[PDB]
Amino acid sequence: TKPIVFSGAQPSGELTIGNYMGALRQWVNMQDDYHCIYCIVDQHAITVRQDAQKLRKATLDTLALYLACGIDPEKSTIFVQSHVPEHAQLGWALNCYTYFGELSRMTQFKDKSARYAENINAGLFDYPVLMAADILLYQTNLVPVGEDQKQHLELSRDIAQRFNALYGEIFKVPEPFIPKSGARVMSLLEPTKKMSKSDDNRNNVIGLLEDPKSVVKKIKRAVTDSDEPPVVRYDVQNKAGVSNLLDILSAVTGQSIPELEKQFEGKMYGHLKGEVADAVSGMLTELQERYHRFRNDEAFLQQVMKDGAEKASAHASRTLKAVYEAIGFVAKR
Amino acid sequence: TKPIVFSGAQPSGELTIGNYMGALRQWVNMQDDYHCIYCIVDQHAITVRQDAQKLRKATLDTLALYLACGIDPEKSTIFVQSHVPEHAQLGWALNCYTYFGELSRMAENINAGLFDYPVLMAADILLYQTNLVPVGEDQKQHLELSRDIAQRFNALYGEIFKVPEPFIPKGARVMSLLEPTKKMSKSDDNRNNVIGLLEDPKSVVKKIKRAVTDSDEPPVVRYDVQNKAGVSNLLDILSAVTGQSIPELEKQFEGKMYGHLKGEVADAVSGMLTELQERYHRFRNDEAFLQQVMKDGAEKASAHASRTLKAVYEAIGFVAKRH
Ligand SMILES: Nc1ncnc2c1ncn2[C@@H]1O[C@H](COP(=O)(O)OC(=O)[C@@H](N)Cc2c[nH]c3ccccc23)[C@@H](O)[C@H]1O
Numbered sequence A: 001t002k003p004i005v006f007s008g009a010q011p012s013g014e015l016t017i018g019n020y021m022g023a024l025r026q027w028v029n030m031q032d033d034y035h036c037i038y039c040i041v042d043q044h045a046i047t048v049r050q051d052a053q054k055l056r057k058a059t060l061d062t063l064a065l066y067l068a069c070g071i072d073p074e075k076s077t078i079f080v081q082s083h084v085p086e087h088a089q090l091g092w093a094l095n096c097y098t099y100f101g102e103l104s105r106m107t108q109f110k111d112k113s114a115r116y117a118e119n120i121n122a123g124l125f126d127y128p129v130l131m132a133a134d135i136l137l138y139q140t141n142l143v144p145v146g147e148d149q150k151q152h153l154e155l156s157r158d159i160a161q162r163f164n165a166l167y168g169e170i171f172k173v174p175e176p177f178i179p180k181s182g183a184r185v186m187s188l189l190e191p192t193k194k195m196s197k198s199d200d201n202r203n204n205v206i207g208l209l210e211d212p213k214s215v216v217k218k219i220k221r222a223v224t225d226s227d228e229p230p231v232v233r234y235d236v237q238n239k240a241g242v243s244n245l246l247d248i249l250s251a252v253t254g255q256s257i258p259e260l261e262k263q264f265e266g267k268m269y270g271h272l273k274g275e276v277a278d279a280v281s282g283m284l285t286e287l288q289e290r291y292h293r294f295r296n297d298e299a300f301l302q303q304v305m306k307d308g309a310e311k312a313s314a315h316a317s318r319t320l321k322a323v324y325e326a327i328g329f330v331a332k333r
Numbered sequence B: 001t002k003p004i005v006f007s008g009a010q011p012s013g014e015l016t017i018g019n020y021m022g023a024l025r026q027w028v029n030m031q032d033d034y035h036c037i038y039c040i041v042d043q044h045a046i047t048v049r050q051d052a053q054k055l056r057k058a059t060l061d062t063l064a065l066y067l068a069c070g071i072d073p074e075k076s077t078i079f080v081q082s083h084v085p086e087h088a089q090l091g092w093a094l095n096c097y098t099y100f101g102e103l104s105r106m107a108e109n110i111n112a113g114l115f116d117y118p119v120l121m122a123a124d125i126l127l128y129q130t131n132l133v134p135v136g137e138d139q140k141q142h143l144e145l146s147r148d149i150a151q152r153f154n155a156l157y158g159e160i161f162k163v164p165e166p167f168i169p170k171g172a173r174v175m176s177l178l179e180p181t182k183k184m185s186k187s188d189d190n191r192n193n194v195i196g197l198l199e200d201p202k203s204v205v206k207k208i209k210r211a212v213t214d215s216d217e218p219p220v221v222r223y224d225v226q227n228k229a230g231v232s233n234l235l236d237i238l239s240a241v242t243g244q245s246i247p248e249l250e251k252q253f254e255g256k257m258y259g260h261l262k263g264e265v266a267d268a269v270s271g272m273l274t275e276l277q278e279r280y281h282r283f284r285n286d287e288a289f290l291q292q293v294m295k296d297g298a299e300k301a302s303a304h305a306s307r308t309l310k311a312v313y314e315a316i317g318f319v320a321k322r323h
């Protein structure tokens, strides 16, 4: 059997080129090399208050984006988190092997709490435990995520090691798979800020489903720097905007940063932005063409969700049974 | 509609005569008045690190003893919490509608289950459209949270949950044998304060013999909680067993010493416990009967719980599972 890949994305907000390069691109590339399981984590999404119709639509939007990106339901397991009860079940059990301080120190909880001071809910606090459950249910070896999820992933390793030390080889210790390019795509007008899929200022984001012409305009208005002469060179500390543009270009084209730097020798931000805009616009055009073919086919989305939950349930139920046996529950009849 | 009562039976800790005569005995006789649900809450148990085999055993011990006390799995619903996934599912969902501040108002080294179990308890109750909860006195804030969560969710989404109420009325006072001012508690570390339902007649005699009394001269068997708490407790225990009134026992023990009272208390308590214990050991050692009870109970519970969860999931907006 192949090693197992698991990762998830929230059906909230609108997935961005940041979500793509930090995660979905790796997801697509790993489907033959590993046994891949990809999840739409609707239970995580509701740690930020969602409109019920937006949440249902976004769940189906996200599924269609997975397919449009090239996640292949004949190769990977694709499912909606709430369709598999074992996620919540293991999540509760793992609460008892997670310490309050491990959770209160999470950067995501802190940032999200500051953004939503009116809804600092227990789900938002407990977010990393459910996420560890998501991973550990599937005997997961590799978790492809962006840099922002590294702290959460490290906790899932701590939890898996803690549990295994008490009970045996119940879980695999997962390892992060974080790309070299695009692991932390930054905001176009505030390049010291991670690009958010829920930004109040849409001019910060490149949405995967956004009108490509709208995206090209945002790219040309992305902030750069005052360097005289303007020079296309990677330097996050001094040239955050130009660096972020180079990172996006490198991630779409596959070209290395040194190659791009050489390509733009003697050139300035107009050439840089012109070809970030060209590359991204073409990617989004092709992606969106596949997207609508999947999104408007309810029968196909319904079948993918059904088969995926069935495949996921078979894995998850096996792990949960071993967890429940280890901690001392009377096994269900 | 016949009200739904939800009770969470914690597996660890053997029930005492205070648990039986003070509450369960009466609930056993209300199984036709209410749709009673008895959930053996193993998922609550694991907030405290404990031996796995002992937790499995205590789950089965608790099930057989509830059956032995007369819970009728045909009239009531009795099941193990972990056998019904909806409890954890609704628990997660209700985390997202519970303020962090609410849990902190109930450090870095406590586990998250210890912090988060009040939400699980709210899910346990709210799954079954529960009308009544016989909470402990230490669980009243927890029930208030469950009511707050239910109303908050209902205000956003419609009348999805019943708002549960405490079961207000109390049925017998059983105090600690060596500290007559303290209720006899199944979680007491001093086992000599308690009489467990499984104790043998020699154990009962010994514990009653050491039960504190007073230095009244002459000794006088008369009820007076303020001045004769130990003797009063022995009288309450004896009346709760035999049904004889406190005045009748006072007349019966006129001119008698505390040794006589204690002798009668032990005999009466052990007589009560013998039919309980016979039923217990017979149920506890019938693995297939226990398995059938848990299978049937989890099936009944899950049928009800899944109805509520699906309404919750529909209201939140989750895409419905494809079966
Ligand atoms: N600007 C950015 N640049 C690069 N990568 C980025 C950027 N913003 C986000 N990401 C990555 O996108 C993925 C999905 O993010 P979500 O917020 O939906 O989703 C999250 O942040 C997860 N907690 C969802 C989840 C739930 N359970 C899991 C188990 C395994 C892996 C992931 C999950 C993530 O990999 C995230 O790192």
Ligand SMILES: CC(=O)NCc1cccc(Oc2ccc(-n3c(=O)n(C4CCNCC4)c4ncnc(N)c43)cc2)c1
Residues within 6 Å of the ligand: B006, B007, B008, B009, B010, B041, B044, B045, B047, B048, B114, B117, B121, B122, B124, B125, B133, B134, B135, B136, B138, B139
């Ligand atoms: C007696 C009764 O029927 N109560 C209603 C009810 C409803 C639903 C679940 C339910 O089960 C539980 C089980 C345990 C708890 N619980 C619980 O009540 N406490 C107490 C212990 C001391 N007094 C204050 C807090 C818990 N401490 C740790 N972990 C827990 N899980 C704790 C809380 C609830 C009980």
Ligand SMILES: O=c1[nH]c2cc(Cl)ccc2o1
Residues within 6 Å of the ligand: A087, A088, A089, A090, A091, A092, A093, A095, A126, A129, A130, A131, A133, B087, B088, B089, B090, B091, B092, B095, B116, B119, B120, B123
């Ligand atoms: O990760 C988690 N936390 C949880 C809390 C409750 Cl109450 C239920 C399931 C959970 O899964």
